[PDB]
Amino acid sequence: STLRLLISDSYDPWFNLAVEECIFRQMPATQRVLFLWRNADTVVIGRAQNPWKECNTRRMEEDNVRLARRSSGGGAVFHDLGNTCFTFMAGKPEYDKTISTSIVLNALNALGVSAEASGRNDLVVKTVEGDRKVSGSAYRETKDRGFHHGTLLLNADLSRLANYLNPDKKKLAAKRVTNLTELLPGITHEQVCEAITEAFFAHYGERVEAEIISPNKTPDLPNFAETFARQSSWEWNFGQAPAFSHLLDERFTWGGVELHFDVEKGHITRAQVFTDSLNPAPLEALAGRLQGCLYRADMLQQECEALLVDFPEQEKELRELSAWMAGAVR
Numbered sequence: 001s002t003l004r005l006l007i008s009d010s011y012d013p014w015f016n017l018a019v020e021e022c023i024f025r026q027m028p029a030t031q032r033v034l035f036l037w038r039n040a041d042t043v044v045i046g047r048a049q050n051p052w053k054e055c056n057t058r059r060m061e062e063d064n065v066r067l068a069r070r071s072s073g074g075g076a077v078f079h080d081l082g083n084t085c086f087t088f089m090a091g092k093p094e095y096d097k098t099i100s101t102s103i104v105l106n107a108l109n110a111l112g113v114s115a116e117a118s119g120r121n122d123l124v125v126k127t128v129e130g131d132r133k134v135s136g137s138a139y140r141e142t143k144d145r146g147f148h149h150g151t152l153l154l155n156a157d158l159s160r161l162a163n164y165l166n167p168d169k170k171k172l173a174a175k176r177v178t179n180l181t182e183l184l185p186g187i188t189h190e191q192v193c194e195a196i197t198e199a200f201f202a203h204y205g206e207r208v209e210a211e212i213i214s215p216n217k218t219p220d221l222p223n224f225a226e227t228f229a230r231q232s233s234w235e236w237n238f239g240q241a242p243a244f245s246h247l248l249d250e251r252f253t254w255g256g257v258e259l260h261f262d263v264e265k266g267h268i269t270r271a272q273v274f275t276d277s278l279n280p281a282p283l284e285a286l287a288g289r290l291q292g293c294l295y296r297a298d299m300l301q302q303e304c305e306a307l308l309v310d311f312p313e314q315e316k317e318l319r320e321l322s323a324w325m326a327g328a329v330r
Protein backbone atom coordinates (compact mmCIF):
# COMPACT_ATOMS: atom_id res chain seq x y z
CA SER A 1 0.00 0.00 0.00
CA THR A 2 0.68 3.74 0.54
CA LEU A 3 2.95 3.24 3.70
CA ARG A 4 6.27 1.58 3.63
CA LEU A 5 8.08 0.90 6.86
CA LEU A 6 11.78 0.30 6.49
CA ILE A 7 13.98 -0.91 9.39
CA SER A 8 17.69 -1.21 8.81
CA ASP A 9 19.33 -4.11 10.54
CA SER A 10 22.83 -2.90 9.71
CA TYR A 11 25.24 -0.46 11.22
CA ASP A 12 26.99 0.12 7.91
CA PRO A 13 26.65 3.88 7.30
CA TRP A 14 27.14 3.54 3.53
CA PHE A 15 24.31 1.11 3.37
CA ASN A 16 22.07 3.28 5.52
CA LEU A 17 22.95 6.35 3.48
CA ALA A 18 22.28 4.66 0.15
CA VAL A 19 18.88 3.68 1.48
CA GLU A 20 18.38 7.30 2.50
CA GLU A 21 19.36 8.48 -0.95
CA CYS A 22 17.06 5.96 -2.64
CA ILE A 23 14.08 7.36 -0.65
CA PHE A 24 14.90 10.89 -1.54
CA ARG A 25 15.35 10.10 -5.21
CA GLN A 26 14.30 6.54 -6.29
CA MET A 27 11.02 5.78 -4.52
CA PRO A 28 7.96 7.54 -5.92
CA ALA A 29 6.41 10.13 -3.54
CA THR A 30 3.28 8.09 -3.84
CA GLN A 31 4.51 6.29 -0.72
CA ARG A 32 4.84 7.43 2.89
CA VAL A 33 8.01 6.12 4.24
CA LEU A 34 9.42 5.70 7.61
CA PHE A 35 12.95 4.48 7.76
CA LEU A 36 14.72 3.64 11.01
CA TRP A 37 18.42 2.95 11.27
CA ARG A 38 21.65 3.71 13.03
CA ASN A 39 25.44 3.71 12.17
CA ALA A 40 28.43 2.34 14.00
CA ASP A 41 31.19 4.88 14.73
CA THR A 42 31.19 7.35 11.83
CA VAL A 43 32.01 10.85 10.77
CA VAL A 44 29.78 12.09 8.06
CA ILE A 45 30.99 15.07 6.07
CA GLY A 46 29.11 17.31 3.61
CA ARG A 47 29.67 16.75 -0.07
CA ALA A 48 32.04 19.67 -0.57
CA GLN A 49 34.31 19.26 2.37
CA ASN A 50 37.93 18.12 2.18
CA PRO A 51 38.38 15.37 4.87
CA TRP A 52 42.18 15.56 4.65
CA LYS A 53 41.95 19.16 5.92
CA GLU A 54 38.93 18.65 8.25
CA CYS A 55 39.70 15.23 9.84
CA ASN A 56 42.40 13.59 11.83
CA THR A 57 42.51 10.59 9.54
CA ARG A 58 45.37 8.94 11.36
CA ARG A 59 43.37 8.82 14.68
CA MET A 60 40.25 7.71 12.81
CA GLU A 61 42.14 4.79 11.30
CA GLU A 62 43.72 3.89 14.72
CA ASP A 63 40.36 4.15 16.45
CA ASN A 64 38.59 2.28 13.64
CA VAL A 65 36.19 5.14 12.79
CA ARG A 66 34.31 5.18 9.42
CA LEU A 67 34.05 8.14 7.01
CA ALA A 68 31.12 8.85 4.78
CA ARG A 69 30.27 11.75 2.60
CA ARG A 70 26.61 12.54 2.43
CA SER A 71 25.48 14.34 -0.73
CA SER A 72 24.22 17.48 0.94
CA GLY A 73 26.08 20.59 2.04
CA GLY A 74 27.06 21.57 5.59
CA GLY A 75 29.71 20.26 8.01
CA ALA A 76 30.78 17.12 9.99
CA VAL A 77 28.47 14.98 12.21
CA PHE A 78 29.22 12.05 14.57
CA HIS A 79 27.30 8.78 14.83
CA ASP A 80 27.50 5.86 17.10
CA LEU A 81 25.11 3.06 17.98
CA GLY A 82 23.86 5.34 20.77
CA ASN A 83 22.16 7.40 18.10
CA THR A 84 18.84 6.26 16.79
CA CYS A 85 17.93 7.77 13.47
CA PHE A 86 14.85 8.45 11.47
CA THR A 87 13.96 9.22 7.89
CA PHE A 88 10.50 10.19 6.77
CA MET A 89 9.58 11.00 3.23
CA ALA A 90 6.23 11.76 1.71
CA GLY A 91 4.82 13.61 -1.36
CA LYS A 92 3.13 16.94 -1.87
CA PRO A 93 1.04 18.97 -1.09
CA GLU A 94 -0.35 16.49 1.44
CA TYR A 95 2.85 16.46 3.48
CA ASP A 96 4.73 19.13 5.34
CA LYS A 97 7.31 19.01 8.06
CA THR A 98 5.11 19.65 11.11
CA ILE A 99 3.80 16.11 10.46
CA SER A 100 6.92 14.12 11.12
CA THR A 101 7.71 16.45 13.99
CA SER A 102 4.31 15.68 15.42
CA ILE A 103 5.01 11.93 15.15
CA VAL A 104 8.38 12.03 16.87
CA LEU A 105 7.03 14.16 19.82
CA ASN A 106 4.13 11.80 20.29
CA ALA A 107 6.46 8.91 20.47
CA LEU A 108 8.74 10.65 22.93
CA ASN A 109 5.69 11.50 24.84
CA ALA A 110 4.70 7.88 24.77
CA LEU A 111 8.02 7.08 26.44
CA GLY A 112 7.41 9.32 29.37
CA VAL A 113 9.27 12.16 27.74
CA SER A 114 7.84 15.53 26.87
CA ALA A 115 9.91 17.71 24.64
CA GLU A 116 9.16 20.11 21.91
CA ALA A 117 10.36 22.05 18.86
CA SER A 118 13.17 24.46 19.60
CA GLY A 119 14.27 26.50 16.58
CA ARG A 120 13.84 25.10 13.09
CA ASN A 121 15.69 21.77 13.51
CA ASP A 122 16.01 20.30 17.07
CA LEU A 123 13.68 18.95 19.71
CA VAL A 124 14.37 19.98 23.29
CA VAL A 125 13.25 18.84 26.77
CA LYS A 126 12.41 21.39 29.44
CA THR A 127 14.73 21.20 32.40
CA VAL A 128 15.27 22.74 35.83
CA GLU A 129 18.75 23.75 34.50
CA GLY A 130 17.30 25.01 31.17
CA ASP A 131 16.70 23.68 27.62
CA ARG A 132 18.52 20.51 26.78
CA LYS A 133 18.74 19.15 23.25
CA VAL A 134 17.64 15.59 22.52
CA SER A 135 17.44 15.49 18.71
CA GLY A 136 18.92 17.29 15.75
CA SER A 137 17.28 17.07 12.33
CA ALA A 138 17.20 18.49 8.80
CA TYR A 139 14.48 19.04 6.28
CA ARG A 140 14.08 19.65 2.58
CA GLU A 141 11.22 19.98 0.21
CA THR A 142 11.50 19.04 -3.43
CA LYS A 143 9.18 19.22 -6.45
CA ASP A 144 7.15 16.01 -5.80
CA ARG A 145 8.19 15.47 -2.15
CA GLY A 146 9.39 16.36 1.30
CA PHE A 147 12.14 14.65 3.29
CA HIS A 148 12.98 14.73 6.99
CA HIS A 149 15.57 12.92 8.94
CA GLY A 150 17.27 13.26 12.16
CA THR A 151 18.86 11.75 15.13
CA LEU A 152 17.63 10.98 18.67
CA LEU A 153 20.37 10.93 21.25
CA LEU A 154 19.87 7.77 23.31
CA ASN A 155 23.32 7.11 24.59
CA ALA A 156 25.76 8.80 22.27
CA ASP A 157 29.20 9.94 23.08
CA LEU A 158 28.85 13.61 22.22
CA SER A 159 32.46 14.90 22.76
CA ARG A 160 34.10 12.23 20.45
CA LEU A 161 33.77 14.32 17.30
CA ALA A 162 36.37 16.68 18.77
CA ASN A 163 39.20 14.08 18.63
CA TYR A 164 38.64 13.17 14.98
CA LEU A 165 38.41 16.69 13.67
CA ASN A 166 41.37 19.10 13.22
CA PRO A 167 41.99 22.56 14.66
CA ASP A 168 40.63 25.12 12.12
CA LYS A 169 42.39 28.29 13.32
CA LYS A 170 40.26 30.81 11.29
CA LYS A 171 37.07 29.07 12.32
CA LEU A 172 38.45 29.30 15.81
CA ALA A 173 39.24 33.01 15.52
CA ALA A 174 35.52 33.55 14.56
CA LYS A 175 33.42 31.96 17.36
CA ARG A 176 23.46 21.90 25.95
CA VAL A 177 22.67 18.30 25.02
CA THR A 178 21.62 15.18 26.99
CA ASN A 179 21.14 11.50 26.31
CA LEU A 180 17.85 9.79 26.97
CA THR A 181 19.87 7.34 28.99
CA GLU A 182 19.85 10.16 31.71
CA LEU A 183 16.01 10.25 31.87
CA LEU A 184 14.90 6.72 30.97
CA PRO A 185 17.69 4.37 31.94
CA GLY A 186 16.53 1.34 30.04
CA ILE A 187 15.58 2.85 26.71
CA THR A 188 16.63 0.76 23.69
CA HIS A 189 16.86 1.52 20.01
CA GLU A 190 14.23 -1.20 19.47
CA GLN A 191 12.01 0.39 22.08
CA VAL A 192 12.48 3.83 20.50
CA CYS A 193 11.73 2.27 17.17
CA GLU A 194 8.37 0.79 18.35
CA ALA A 195 7.41 4.12 19.84
CA ILE A 196 8.02 6.15 16.63
CA THR A 197 6.65 3.34 14.53
CA GLU A 198 3.34 3.54 16.38
CA ALA A 199 3.14 7.27 16.38
CA PHE A 200 3.58 6.75 12.62
CA PHE A 201 0.88 4.05 12.17
CA ALA A 202 -1.33 6.24 14.45
CA HIS A 203 -1.06 9.38 12.32
CA TYR A 204 -1.89 7.68 9.04
CA GLY A 205 -4.57 5.29 10.37
CA GLU A 206 -2.90 2.16 8.94
CA ARG A 207 -0.14 -0.43 9.70
CA VAL A 208 2.09 -2.44 7.37
CA GLU A 209 4.68 -5.20 7.86
CA ALA A 210 8.17 -4.03 8.58
CA GLU A 211 10.73 -4.57 5.79
CA ILE A 212 13.98 -5.57 7.57
CA ILE A 213 16.69 -4.51 5.20
CA SER A 214 20.41 -5.13 5.56
CA PRO A 215 23.12 -5.17 2.99
CA ASN A 216 23.45 -8.94 2.65
CA LYS A 217 20.39 -8.74 0.32
CA THR A 218 18.97 -6.05 -2.00
CA PRO A 219 16.22 -4.05 -0.35
CA ASP A 220 13.29 -3.39 -2.61
CA LEU A 221 14.25 0.05 -3.86
CA PRO A 222 14.89 0.86 -7.54
CA ASN A 223 18.59 1.10 -8.57
CA PHE A 224 19.82 0.19 -5.14
CA ALA A 225 22.83 -1.79 -6.17
CA GLU A 226 24.30 0.97 -8.25
CA THR A 227 23.48 3.50 -5.48
CA PHE A 228 25.10 1.38 -2.76
CA ALA A 229 28.18 0.78 -4.90
CA ARG A 230 28.85 4.48 -5.52
CA GLN A 231 27.88 5.57 -2.05
CA SER A 232 30.29 3.11 -0.52
CA SER A 233 33.19 3.73 -2.78
CA TRP A 234 36.43 5.17 -1.37
CA GLU A 235 36.57 7.66 -4.24
CA TRP A 236 33.19 9.10 -3.30
CA ASN A 237 33.77 9.08 0.47
CA PHE A 238 37.41 10.19 0.49
CA GLY A 239 38.93 11.15 -2.83
CA GLN A 240 42.68 12.05 -3.22
CA ALA A 241 43.87 15.06 -1.21
CA PRO A 242 43.94 18.18 -3.40
CA ALA A 243 47.41 19.08 -4.73
CA PHE A 244 47.78 22.57 -6.14
CA SER A 245 50.29 25.26 -5.61
CA HIS A 246 48.09 28.18 -4.29
CA LEU A 247 45.70 28.16 -1.32
CA LEU A 248 43.13 30.76 -0.18
CA ASP A 249 40.74 30.19 2.68
CA GLU A 250 38.54 32.30 4.91
CA ARG A 251 35.81 31.63 7.42
CA PHE A 252 32.50 33.48 6.85
CA THR A 253 29.37 33.88 9.02
CA TRP A 254 27.86 31.20 6.65
CA GLY A 255 30.87 28.87 6.31
CA GLY A 256 34.60 28.13 5.60
CA VAL A 257 35.99 28.11 2.08
CA GLU A 258 39.27 26.71 0.85
CA LEU A 259 40.15 27.68 -2.67
CA HIS A 260 43.00 25.73 -4.33
CA PHE A 261 44.53 26.51 -7.68
CA ASP A 262 47.29 26.87 -10.19
CA VAL A 263 48.48 29.86 -12.15
CA GLU A 264 50.36 29.61 -15.41
CA LYS A 265 51.05 32.54 -17.66
CA GLY A 266 48.82 34.78 -15.57
CA HIS A 267 45.67 32.56 -15.82
CA ILE A 268 44.28 29.78 -13.64
CA THR A 269 44.93 26.37 -15.13
CA ARG A 270 43.17 24.28 -12.55
CA ALA A 271 41.22 25.01 -9.38
CA GLN A 272 39.13 23.47 -6.69
CA VAL A 273 36.90 24.66 -3.92
CA PHE A 274 35.91 23.13 -0.64
CA THR A 275 33.45 24.41 1.96
CA ASP A 276 31.10 23.40 4.86
CA SER A 277 28.40 25.84 3.87
CA LEU A 278 24.87 24.38 4.06
CA ASN A 279 24.45 25.14 0.40
CA PRO A 280 27.74 24.48 -1.50
CA ALA A 281 26.21 24.94 -4.97
CA PRO A 282 27.30 28.51 -5.58
CA LEU A 283 30.90 27.65 -4.60
CA GLU A 284 30.82 24.49 -6.69
CA ALA A 285 29.72 26.53 -9.63
CA LEU A 286 32.42 29.10 -8.74
CA ALA A 287 35.28 26.70 -9.17
CA GLY A 288 33.48 25.85 -12.39
CA ARG A 289 33.89 29.31 -13.77
CA LEU A 290 37.32 29.86 -12.39
CA GLN A 291 39.21 27.54 -14.78
CA GLY A 292 41.06 29.47 -17.43
CA CYS A 293 40.28 32.71 -15.64
CA LEU A 294 42.63 35.61 -15.95
CA TYR A 295 44.39 35.53 -12.61
CA ARG A 296 43.70 39.13 -11.60
CA ALA A 297 41.26 40.74 -9.09
CA ASP A 298 38.92 42.22 -11.70
CA MET A 299 38.33 38.94 -13.72
CA LEU A 300 38.04 36.81 -10.60
CA GLN A 301 35.46 39.25 -9.38
CA GLN A 302 33.74 39.20 -12.72
CA GLU A 303 33.36 35.45 -12.84
CA CYS A 304 32.25 35.18 -9.26
CA GLU A 305 29.63 37.83 -9.94
CA ALA A 306 28.17 36.47 -13.24
CA LEU A 307 26.82 33.69 -11.00
CA LEU A 308 24.36 35.99 -9.30
CA VAL A 309 21.46 35.71 -11.74
CA ASP A 310 20.95 31.99 -10.84
CA PHE A 311 21.72 32.29 -7.13
CA PRO A 312 19.43 35.06 -5.85
CA GLU A 313 19.12 33.33 -2.39
CA GLN A 314 22.91 33.34 -2.02
CA GLU A 315 23.63 36.88 -3.19
CA LYS A 316 25.39 37.90 0.06
CA GLU A 317 27.49 34.79 0.08
CA LEU A 318 28.65 35.72 -3.51
CA ARG A 319 29.21 39.43 -2.73
CA GLU A 320 31.48 38.58 0.21
CA LEU A 321 33.28 35.98 -1.94
CA SER A 322 33.86 38.52 -4.64
CA ALA A 323 35.09 41.15 -2.19
CA TRP A 324 37.32 38.64 -0.46
CA MET A 325 38.97 37.54 -3.63
CA ALA A 326 39.59 41.02 -4.88
CA GLY A 327 41.28 41.92 -1.64
CA ALA A 328 43.11 38.66 -1.43
CA VAL A 329 44.99 38.48 -4.79
CA ARG A 330 48.31 40.40 -4.36
Ligand SMILES: O=C(O)CCCC[C@@H]1CCSS1
Pocket residue numbers: 020021024070071072073074138139140147278
Ligand atom coordinates in the same frame (compact mmCIF):
# COMPACT_ATOMS: atom_id res chain seq x y z
O1 LIG B 1 22.04 17.44 5.98
C1 LIG B 1 21.59 18.54 5.57
O2 LIG B 1 21.96 19.67 6.02
C2 LIG B 1 20.54 18.50 4.46
C3 LIG B 1 19.77 17.17 4.49
C4 LIG B 1 18.79 17.14 3.32
C5 LIG B 1 18.27 15.73 3.09
C6 LIG B 1 18.67 15.18 1.72
C7 LIG B 1 17.83 13.96 1.35
C8 LIG B 1 18.51 12.59 1.13
S1 LIG B 1 20.15 12.56 1.75
S2 LIG B 1 20.30 14.56 1.73
